Design an enzyme around this catalytic site. Structure first.
Site, PDB file in Angstrom:
ATOM      1  CD  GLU A   1      -4.765  -6.974  -7.011  1.00 32.94           C
ATOM      2  OE1 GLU A   1      -3.952  -6.476  -6.242  1.00 32.94           O
ATOM      3  OE2 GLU A   1      -5.677  -6.287  -7.555  1.00 32.94           O
TER       4      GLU A   1
ATOM      5  CG  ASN B   1      -1.877  -0.666   2.164  1.00 26.68           C
ATOM      6  OD1 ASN B   1      -2.773  -1.413   2.602  1.00 26.68           O
ATOM      7  ND2 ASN B   1      -1.424  -0.769   0.918  1.00 26.68           N
TER       8      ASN B   1
ATOM      9  CG  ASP C   1      -3.933   2.028   6.690  1.00 20.25           C
ATOM     10  OD1 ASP C   1      -3.560   1.631   5.570  1.00 20.25           O
ATOM     11  OD2 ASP C   1      -4.823   1.439   7.347  1.00 20.25           O
TER      12      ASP C   1
ATOM     13  CB  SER D   1      -3.888  -1.671   6.436  1.00 23.56           C
ATOM     14  OG  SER D   1      -3.860  -1.080   5.147  1.00 23.56           O
TER      15      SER D   1
ATOM     16  CG  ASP E   1      -3.192  -4.546   0.018  1.00 24.65           C
ATOM     17  OD1 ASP E   1      -4.127  -4.298   0.796  1.00 24.65           O
ATOM     18  OD2 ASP E   1      -2.767  -3.681  -0.754  1.00 24.65           O
TER      19      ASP E   1
ATOM     20  CG  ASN F   1      -6.865  -3.462   3.249  1.00 25.32           C
ATOM     21  OD1 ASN F   1      -7.566  -3.288   4.253  1.00 25.32           O
ATOM     22  ND2 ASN F   1      -5.672  -2.909   3.027  1.00 25.32           N
TER      23      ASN F   1
ATOM     24  CG  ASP G   1     -19.929  -3.879  -1.215  1.00 23.85           C
ATOM     25  OD1 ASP G   1     -20.974  -3.150  -1.421  1.00 23.85           O
ATOM     26  OD2 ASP G   1     -18.801  -3.324  -0.925  1.00 23.85           O
TER      27      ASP G   1
END
Length: 129
Positions: free
Chosen positions: A35, A46, A48, A50, A52, A59, A101
């Site tokens: 990672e 990223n 958008d 955004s 990480d 994120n 989740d």
């Protein structure tokens, strides 16, 4: 900073990630290697707007705050800097809320195309543990 395997494995054990939700320590360590190659200051930006962050590339559109990420759900309820400190606590504390989740470790892209399916406990062997 940057951790050694064992160091990360041990930091990961004291924190109680061994067999967390069915995830052996080996998995935590392996996801951390592909990672971010164990660098807590690693950051991918990223399209958008955004990013990480940290050792597990969390994120900011979902789990943390950085001050612009779109919907920015901030499901972990943490500032993303907390994820750049060398004190791995916040990324550990968020990691447990993400795995929880209907995603499991599939939430981690590097773990799914790299760790999933292999003898991942190989990541904590030869570490005096």
């Amino acid at each position: 900073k940057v951790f050694g395997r064992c160091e990360l494995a041990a930091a990961m054990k004291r924190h109680g990630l061994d067999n967390y939700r069915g995830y052996s320590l080996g998995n935590w360590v392996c996801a951390a290697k592909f990672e971010s190659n164990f660098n807590t200051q690693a950051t991918n930006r990223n399209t958008d707007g955004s990013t990480d962050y940290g050792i597990l590339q969390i994120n900011s559109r979902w789990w943390c705050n950085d001050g612009r990420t779109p919907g920015s759900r901030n499901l972990c309820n943490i500032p993303c800097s907390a994820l750049l400190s060398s004190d791995i606590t916040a990324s550990v504390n968020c990691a447990k809320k993400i795995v929880s989740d209907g995603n499991g470790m599939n939430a981690w892209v590097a773990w799914r195309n790299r760790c999933k399916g292999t003898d991942v406990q190989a990541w904590i062997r030869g570490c005096r543990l």
